[model samples]
Target: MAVKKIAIFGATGQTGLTTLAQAVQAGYEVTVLVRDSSRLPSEGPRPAHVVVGDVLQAADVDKTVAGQDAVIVLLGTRNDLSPTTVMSEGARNIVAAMKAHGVDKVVACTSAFLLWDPTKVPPRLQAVTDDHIRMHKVLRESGLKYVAVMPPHIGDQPLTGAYTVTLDGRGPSRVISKHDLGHFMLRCLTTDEYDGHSTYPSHQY
Candidate 1:
């Protein structure tokens, strides 16, 4: 496979960091967008490129999305009373930019229960799941090539190289390894076998 120019959002997170390391090892030209550049290692063996910006800003996202073959978003939220729309807003910005730049391939990660059996979701996370559903809706309606990786209770385990995956929320499991999730996120960019706007619920037994 030819090396692809890729831009990653939320590259400071655990999954994103793991994805970044994998992308770099795979010899892809990777660019990471972060709010605080200091949080990343600039002096050591580093990513191909880095942009200091927030996902909520259009110009910042535009700058990062430009000239990239694909994008990966691993945005998560914090516990706060403020209106929670970061994921949706970020998706809107990314889709708009992708349209502008003609870059369509996108792989994003959301909660596993976003569009699955709500009865399985814990009561305390209902609100968060609702937000994830809204975010997934934005991507589904965007008319762009996107893959939403919905994994639950992501464990901090090494990649088992084996996990179950369901296309479009057919049958979702309760947990998955972060390493495998990271691997799958990058795998989505290389082939069209998993193309189209759909959710891939992944988990391990």
Candidate 2:
């Protein structure tokens, strides 16, 4: 089988780093986009390519996404002050770049609250929830193959690969390991079992 090529955004983040290592170990030609290369590991195995850039910038995103079969996004922010819209902006740029480059697949990590009924989400999270909802809208309308992995609180635990995936908009389990989430994202890239515009919530029992 020919090896797959993928680019990862938010490669310095916890889940992104795990996914980067997993994809590299799995023999996929992996590239990563990061704002700071210092944040990536220098001691262990690394991705095939690393491009330093901001996800909100179209030029930076386009450079990283070129010549890739798919892209996996794991971006998050500790700075939500003001209307950052970082996630939504990143999603928009990624989709635009993918369309321009003819790369169709996108497996992105978003919040599980996005899959819940609006009334169920706490008022405090409404802004972030709305941001994610907008991101999903961009993906759905992009005409590219997409899988939005809506996961709940991700713990820094070992990979058990024991999680439930509900594609419907039902209640998801409370938590899942970051490693397992990485495993699932990599799987989505290599398989055709999941289709475009599909949103799935992953959680551990």
Candidate 3:
């Protein structure tokens, strides 16, 4: 597996934290980029290395992307819901850095709004959705092995250790546990499943 040495962006977020915990427990050499290292869990398996930086800065992103087997992008707005373009902008920086380093595998955390028709999206989500679209566009055109793990109504529940995934919009459930989403994120990163497209993840239990 080309995923043992992995770098994680947004490593302090919900699913990102879970991935960090699991990755370290599973013996992977984890490197995480964060604006503040204090946000990392106080008592647990921590990442092997930490790069203090912002993902939107190309130089900071380059520092994190270099020499990694793969990258996991969990960038989000912490429910800011306002007009924003940070996600896409950060993705651009990440893409540029990854390209410069020749690291091709990436797993991005996105929302299910990606499947909604762009012209018909509700006003409240339009801005966030639009940014996600742009970020997805970057990944698709980057000519790299990428997977966007799109989830719907991620509940703050514990992991059932299983979730159903579908590339099409025909998925049946709307709520997936955050832990399960984290599990899926790492799963897609360390394996070849769901490459080159968007996939929905819903808790099986």
Candidate 4:
């Protein structure tokens, strides 16, 4: 069987960097799209290539996304002070680029708050949940073989190789490690359950 060619956006972020490392270790021909290629690790596994691109630029994303078998998106600003909708914009651009390039397999990251039913969610996550809902809406209407990985509050802890996965965000949530979230994203690259749906890989206290 031919090896899968994978492209990753948000390659410089914590979770994304972890995912890139795992994918490279797993022997996937990985291509990373980022605004700053120099920010990528220079001494790690050399099995993958890094392409310079901005998530906001359709042309840049199209360059790396073209001719790849699968695309993984982990784009987001590292701020919690205000609402950020860049994920939705980046997602739409990626979906469009994938369609144009004839690559349909996509795995993306969004927050669990986006899946909240409001009546079942805690008040602290209302804003976050609302933002994710909008982002999910963008993905749902994107018309691709898409997998949305919704993680709860991300923790900088060590990975235990154990986490929870669900379709809805209707329970208690705690901070999940960036490492485990990366694990789940890589798992979705081959797992059938996450191949065509939105999922919440939750964490508990």
TM-score leader: 3
Instruction: For candidate 1, write residues 1-205 as lDDT tens digits.
Output: 4428999998878788777887888778898889988777544346888888888999999999999999999887745424478888988898898889989888889876765678988777766777777778888788788887887777787876577677656554666777788888888887777766455546555
For candidate 1, give the lDDT of residue 72.
Answer: 93
| Per-candidate TM-score against the hidden true structure | 0.89, 0.91, 0.94, 0.86
Q: Please give, for residues 1-205, the per-residue lDDT of candidate 2 as tens digits.
A: 3429999998888899888988898888898988989999986669999898899999999999999988998988754634558888999999999989989899988777776666887777777777888888888788788888888778887887777777764545667788888998988877766756355545554
The TM-score that candidate 2 achieves is 0.91
**Residue ranges of candidate 3 with Cα displaced over 4 Å:** 117-120
- Candidate with more favorable, higher TM-score: 3 or 4: 3
* Per-residue lDDT of model 3, residues 16-67, tens digit only: 8987898888788999999998899889898998999898788999999999
The better-scoring model by lDDT among 1 and 2 is 2
**TM-score for candidate 3, residues paired by index:** 0.94
lDDT of 1: 0.79
For model 4, what is the C-alpha lDDT against the true structure? 0.78
lDDT of each candidate versus the true structure: 0.79, 0.82, 0.85, 0.78
How far in Å is the alpha carbon of 58 misplaced in model 4?
Answer: 0.9
Q: Of 2 and 4, which scores higher on TM-score?
A: 2
What clash count goes with each model? Answer: 0, 0, 0, 2
Where does candidate 4 clash, by residue pair?
113-129, 114-133
